[PDB]
Amino acid sequence: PGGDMSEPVTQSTLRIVGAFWRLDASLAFRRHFPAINWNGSYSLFTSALDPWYRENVAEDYPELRDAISELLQREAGLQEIVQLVGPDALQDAERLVIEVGRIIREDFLQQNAYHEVDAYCSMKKAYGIMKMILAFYKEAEAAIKRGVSIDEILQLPVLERIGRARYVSEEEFPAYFEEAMKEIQGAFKAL
Amino acid sequence: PGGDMSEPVTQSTLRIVGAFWRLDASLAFRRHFPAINWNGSYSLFTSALDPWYRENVAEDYPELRDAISELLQREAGLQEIVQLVGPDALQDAERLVIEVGRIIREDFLQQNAYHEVDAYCSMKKAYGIMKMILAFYKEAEAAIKRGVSIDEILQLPVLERIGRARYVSEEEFPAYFEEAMKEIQGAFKAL
Amino acid sequence: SQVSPTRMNLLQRRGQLRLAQKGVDLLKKKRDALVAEFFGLVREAMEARKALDQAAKEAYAALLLAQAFDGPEVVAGAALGVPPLEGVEAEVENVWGSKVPRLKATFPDGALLSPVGTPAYTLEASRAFRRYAEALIRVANTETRLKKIGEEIKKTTRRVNALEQVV
Amino acid sequence: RLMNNGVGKGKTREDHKQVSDQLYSAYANGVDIRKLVAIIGEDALTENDRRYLQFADAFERFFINQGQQNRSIEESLQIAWALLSMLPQGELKRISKDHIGKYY
Amino acid sequence: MAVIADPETAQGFRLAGLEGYGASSAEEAQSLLETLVERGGYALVAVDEALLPDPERAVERLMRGRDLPVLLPIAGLKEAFQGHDVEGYMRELVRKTIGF
């Protein structure tokens, strides 16, 4: 009746259910749909389905999922200090984590139900996008250790490639993903 | 339930009671037993009780008590910013005040309740200890005013002599007190 | 104006209070390191000024021998042969806090061409002034960094006070 | 609350309470300097802070994370002492030397 | 690359580069300092302590966030430099940012 999760129905409907997909209002004002709050929700089935994932999607899909979740819910803590001080007094690795978090949040957790082909994403397509994001982050970490600057790391156009990699259809993706993967692996050691 | 002096129970008990003794836990963590926060406690039975003090302890007991309270107040007000630049970059009067406050709150305001002869400090014994501490402060300020160093002051033997004051019995204390005051006043001119 | 809606914002306000307290007790730990560096810098400044005084006395002494043995063609070469040189370097090394422009300074010294049988006491005077310039460069290097780190100390202390008193 | 009544010579071991105190202190130190590092950098740290950071990380990754194991009390204390060894002596400001000797 | 001091040492500075502008034209030195920073092509201006080079209020007023020559008090003369160390120490400490 006001959005608060303290109503008797909103509480009694916990403690009895499995997943719980808490929607947030500000994400729905920004026109960022769907407005699923990524730290108030939870799931209880994500530990009995791993055999099925290993059998029908990939072999390290559980590990990729774990890495993605860990990166999100570690970036949150840094975002606290961001809002305290400002996103310029941070180090380079910290700003890299913030920017990878934003790339994830805008290219893998966003979905417009009115597009022509970005309205039904299957498991292999999601796993492909996750693989691309993880590889980009790994190579960028290595390069930041080397010493290149985060502004160049961000101006690398593989940013926009793996960004728009979601408006593809489902037929040419097995080749699009291979091309973009090899292009990332090349362009992030070229410099 | 939480420890806040604003609930109804505490709000009434205060203003129904007289004295108030603020047992604290951090002071216990610093091994300061008993742990009674003098910056938060307070009492109201001092004014109407002074006459008993004048007629049964001594004639300057109120003024000794008030001087000790002022010493502690100033030590805390100084400690406000000591830890910033460390207790070494202060003028000699400040370090003298801090060392005297340490003497006070480490050899007068602390009572090992498990000892044999140190569990019941009589009124005369407390008066004697306060007298010795104030005498040492007077002679140390008399030395610093002339320009002696702030290292002989702390290396003197009268410091230890008054440090072992409370652990003595209640029979030898008048003689110990006379000898201690004589020895302080003596040994605080040769250096 | 209007206080925010009056339920389920209580949890959020307590969360914000916890975050503000964490922020205060982190800013304190940052200021501790700022001071631990400031003291070393104010230690080095003393040695810098010491060497500057040394070179000053040296060059002032070695210059008054050009007083007594005043050389006409000597000071004419002081007018004829002299390069006005600009070692205007703005090297930046460390940016503490946010982006803080640090100013370093190096010394491009010329050649000072002179004929074959050139030397005199003015040569020793000029070399003494060169050492003097080295020491002056040292001092002007250190004092800027010192004032910068001091301003950083003051900024963080102002933030801590404003937070813990107003917010 | 009733912990100090259940540990000591004759019940489990001697260094139990002191080991617990020291582990608590070191973990709090590490968990603070992690945020400090995130704000300032590994450039302006000291060696003790570097070592405390590594200790905190190893404590989260070796002492809490255990899965489906059944650690006895001797095994848990051995892991605790191995983890505490990563710090230099004289920093163990809560343990007694008669204990530091036989262990560490 | 500049200095403001008595002429005998100003020409001494002139002896080996680093033009010196004597104090015989500005003992207060505010005018010569302002003119030198106006021309601006210098890396530092070491000002002698004729009266005081410390109040740079108006200097930083004219600069207002500039990477200009760095003001630096140099000296007054050479007759004794024994307590000048702790003098600079105290003054730079208490009068600048950090209190006390």
For an interface test with E, give the residue of C86, C106, C134, C141 to mutate (most E CBs within 10 A): C86
Query: Whole-angstrom Cα distance, residue B79 to residue B85?
Result: 11
Strands E44-47 and E70-73: parallel
Query: Whole-angstrom Cα distance, residue D23 to residue D30?
Result: 11
Please answer yes or no on whether D38 and A91 come within 8 Å at the CB atom. yes
Please answer yes or no on whether A6 and C99 come within 8 Å at the CB atom. no
Query: Whole-angstrom Cα distance, residue A138 to residue A127?
Result: 16
Query: Whole-angstrom Cα distance, residue B106 to residue B111?
Result: 9
For an interface test with A, give the residue of C6, C8, C29, C34 to mutate (most A CBs within 10 A): C8
Please report where in the chains the tokens 């390290």 appear, as a residue: A60
- CA proximity to A21, closest of A2, A1, A5: A5
Please answer yes or no on whether C26 and D40 come within 8 Å at the CB atom. no
SS3 A23: strand
Backbone angles phi, psi at A42, to 5 degrees: -165, 170
- CB nearest D44 (choices: C22, C26, C33): C33
Query: Whole-angstrom Cα distance, residue A160 to residue A183?
Result: 13
Tell me whether the omega of the peptide bond preceding residue A34 falls within 30 degrees of 0, making it cis.
yes
Query: Whole-angstrom Cα distance, residue E74 to residue E68?
Result: 18
Cβ contacts of B84 on chain C, cutoff 8 Å: 31, 35
By CA distance, what is E70's nearest residue in C?
C140
Cβ contacts of E76 on chain C, cutoff 8 Å: none
SS3 A128: helix
Question: Residues 6 or more apart from A149 whose CB is under 8 A from it?
Answer: A92
The secondary structure element, H or E, covering residue E3 is: strand E3-4
CA distances from C26 to A75, A129, B85, C37, D34 (A): 18, 38, 18, 17, 11
> Contacts from B76-80 at CB under 8 Å and sequence distance 24+?
B76/B39, B76/B101
Tell how far CA B166 is from the center of its chain: 12
Query: Whole-angstrom Cα distance, residue B140 to residue B100?
Result: 9
Query: Whole-angstrom Cα distance, residue C143 to residue E91?
Result: 13
Please answer yes or no on whether D39 and A78 come within 8 Å at the CB atom. no
- The alpha carbon of residue C164 is apart from the nearest alpha carbon of chain A, in Å, by 14
Query: Whole-angstrom Cα distance, residue C11 to residue B86?
Result: 39
- CB nearest E72 (choices: C57, C88, C140): C140
Q: By the 8 A CB rule, do D65 and C56 touch?
A: no
For an interface test with D, give the residue of C21, C96, C160 to mutate (most D CBs within 10 A): C96
Cβ contacts of E84 on chain C, cutoff 8 Å: 49, 53
CB of A81 within 8 Å of a chain D CB? The answer is yes
Q: Side-chain half-sphere of E52: how many Cα atoms within 13 Å?
A: 5
Q: By the 8 A CB rule, do E11 and C63 touch?
A: no
Calculate the dihedral angle through the C-alpha atoms of B87, D29, C165, E98, rounding to the nearest 10 degrees: 40
Question: To 10 degrees, what angle do helices C121-166 and C72-80 make?
Answer: 50
CB of A82 within 8 Å of a chain D CB? The answer is no
Neighbours of chain E (3+ CB pairs under 8 A): C
Please answer yes or no on whether C30 and D32 come within 8 Å at the CB atom. no
Query: Whole-angstrom Cα distance, residue B81 to residue B103?
Result: 20
- The alpha carbon of residue C83 is apart from the nearest alpha carbon of chain E, in Å, by 5
Query: Whole-angstrom Cα distance, residue D20 to residue B150?
Result: 40
Cβ contacts of C82 on chain E, cutoff 8 Å: 14-17
Please report where in the chains the tokens 């007991």 appear, as a residue: B61
Amino acid of residue E12: G
Query: Whole-angstrom Cα distance, residue A61 to residue A124?
Result: 10
Under DSSP, the state recorded for A20 is B
- The alpha carbon of residue C52 is apart from the nearest alpha carbon of chain D, in Å, by 29
- Positive or negative torsion for Cα E76, E77, E79, E81: positive
Q: By the 8 A CB rule, do D55 and D86 touch?
A: yes
- The alpha carbon of residue A90 is apart from the nearest alpha carbon of chain D, in Å, by 6
Query: Whole-angstrom Cα distance, residue A168 to residue A172?
Result: 7
Backbone angles phi, psi at E46, to 5 degrees: -80, 110
Neighbours of chain A (3+ CB pairs under 8 A): C, D
Query: Whole-angstrom Cα distance, residue B189 to residue D93?
Result: 40
- CA proximity to C59, closest of C139, C138, C137, C133: C133
Q: What's the maximum distance between 2 C-alpha atoms anywhere in chain B?
A: 60
By CA distance, what is E93's nearest residue in C?
C42
**What is the experimental resolution, given in Å to one decimal place?**
3.5
Question: Residues 6 or more apart from D39 whose CB is under 8 A from it?
Answer: A81, A85, A89, A90, C26, C30
Beta bridge partners of A15: none
CA distances from C161 to B85, C24, C25, C164, E71 (A): 17, 9, 12, 5, 32
Backbone angles phi, psi at D85, to 5 degrees: -60, -30
- The alpha carbon of residue B36 is apart from the nearest alpha carbon of chain C, in Å, by 25
Neighbours of chain D (3+ CB pairs under 8 A): A, C
Amino acid of residue B94: E
Q: Where are the beta strands (DSSP E) in chain C?
A: none
By CA distance, what is A90's nearest residue in C?
C98
Q: Side-chain half-sphere of B82: how many Cα atoms within 13 Å?
A: 16
Neighbours of D14 (CB within 10 A): 16
SS3 E52: coil
Neighbours of chain C (3+ CB pairs under 8 A): A, B, D, E
Domain of residue A88 covers 44-191
* Burial class of residue B131 in the structure, from the number of CB atoms within 10 Å of its CB (0-12 exposed, 13-18 middle, 19+ buried): middle
By CA distance, what is C97's nearest residue in D?
D40
- CB nearest C8 (choices: A6, A80, A89): A6
Question: Residues 6 or more apart from C20 whose CB is under 8 A from it?
Answer: C163, C167
- CA proximity to C148, closest of C95, C107, C106, C110: C95
Amino acid of residue A52: W
Please report where in the chains the tokens 């105190």 appear, as a residue: D21
Beta bridge partners of A23: A36
Query: Whole-angstrom Cα distance, residue B75 to residue B98?
Result: 6
HEC profile of B3-56: CCCCCHHHHHHCCCCCCECCECCHHHHCCCCCCECCCCCECCCCHHHHHHHHHH
CB of A94 within 8 Å of a chain D CB? The answer is yes
> Contacts from A150-158 at CB under 8 Å and sequence distance 24+?
A150/A92, A150/A95, A150/A96, A150/A99, A152/A191, A153/A96, A154/A99, A156/A187, A156/A188, A158/A183, A158/A184, A158/A187, A158/A188
- CB nearest C46 (choices: E18, E78, E89): E89
Amino acid of residue D39: I
Query: Whole-angstrom Cα distance, residue A136 to residue A180?
Result: 11
Cβ contacts of C39 on chain D, cutoff 8 Å: none
Please answer yes or no on whether C5 and A2 come within 8 Å at the CB atom. yes
Q: Hey, where are the domains in chain C?
A: 1-167
Return residues 21-40 of D near C (CB < 8 Å).
32-33, 35-36, 39-40
Q: Give the residue before each break in chain E, using a C-to-N cut-off of over 2.5 angstroms; say none if it is continuous.
A: none
- CA proximity to B180, closest of B128, B139, B125, B126: B128
- Positive or negative torsion for Cα C77, C80, C86, C87: negative
Per the entry, the structure determination technique was cryo-EM
Query: Whole-angstrom Cα distance, residue B11 to residue B97?
Result: 36
Query: Whole-angstrom Cα distance, residue A103 to residue A72?
Result: 11
Query: Whole-angstrom Cα distance, residue A46 to residue A66?
Result: 11
